[PDB]
Amino acid sequence: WTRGTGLMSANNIIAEGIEKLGVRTFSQKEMAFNILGLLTPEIVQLCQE
Amino acid sequence: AAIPENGNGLDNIDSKSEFAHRIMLTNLLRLLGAVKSKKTTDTRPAQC
Amino acid sequence: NNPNELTIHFGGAKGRAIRDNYIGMMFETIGEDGALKSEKIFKDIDETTTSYTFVSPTGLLSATQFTQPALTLMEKAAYEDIKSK
């Protein structure tokens, strides 16, 4: 769940709601952090096998 | 890359959905399939 | 097609099988002082290196470690052609 602008502005009002279950949503700088961590040199060698 | 499409149900798979399926899949594979043919070196992988 | 520089890439499974050729190629040169300087000169290729670049401003075929395998291949190409006749 990425919380961003655009056409998902009608969905940001319930991100607080499903986070009360023990689940977490993400801002765009967080799914920035989460995919750039797939480019670490230990994942990079792991993708090659 | 993707297209914003919404309201296209199964009865309304329309031309914006055939163009979004080409953007997101049947020409994403041609994008990965073309970086393959331009590679000649097996020592440089391209992490998709 | 003589380049001015060449990047060697240490890529996947067979690419890590290529850079450990370069790690094992270690020359030892003791100094004039008698002390055995057992030192590492290839800091540039180690267990984290994924690419190394050979640089020569004149051209690679004029650089020393590439000019001499180009000759002895050419001179054996001319010899074995002469020998086959």
Nearest to B47 among A6, A7, A47 (CB): A47
Residues 6+ positions from C6 with CB-CB distance below 8 Å:
C53, C54, C60
**Ramachandran bin of B46, using left for φ above 0, alpha for ψ from -120 to 50, beta for the remaining angles:** beta
User: Does any CB of chain B come closer than 8 Å to the CB of residue C12?
Assistant: yes
- The Cα–Cα gap between C25 and C60 comes to 20
The CATH number of the domain holding residue C16 is 6.10.60.10
Six token digits for residue B11 = 């009865």
Q: What is the DSSP string of A1-49?
A: -EE-SSTTTTTGGGHHHHGGGT---EEHHHHHHHHHGGGSHHHHHHHT-
User: Which residues from B are below 8 Å from A39, CB to CB?
Assistant: 47
C11–A48: do the CB atoms touch at under 8 Å?
Answer: yes
Q: Report the DSSP beta bridge partners of residue B20.
A: none
Task: Compute how many other C-beta atoms are within 10 angstroms of the C-beta atom of residue B14.
Answer: 13
The nearest CA of chain A is from the CA of B3 a distance in Å of: 11
What method was applied to determine this entry? cryo-EM
Taking the C-alpha atoms of residue B19 and residue C32, their distance in angstroms, rounded to an integer, is 74
> Tokens representing B14?
């329309």
A48/C contact by beta carbon, under 8 A: yes
Torsion sign, CA atoms A28, A29, A31, A36: positive
Phi/psi of residue C61, nearest 5 degrees: -75, -15
Distance, CA of C74 to CA of B48 (rounded, Å): 41
Strand partners, C5: C55
The neighbour count for residue B1, using CB atoms within 10 Å, is 8
Q: What is the DSSP string of B1-48?
A: ------S--STT--HHHHHHHIIIIITTHHHHHHHHHH---TT-----
Q: Which of A6, A7, A48 sits opposite B45 (nearest CB)?
A: A48
Range of the domain at C47: 4-58
Helix (H) / strand (E) containing C6: strand C5-9
- Å resolution of this model? 2.8
Distances (CA, A) of C4 to C56, C62, C66, C70: 6, 9, 12, 16
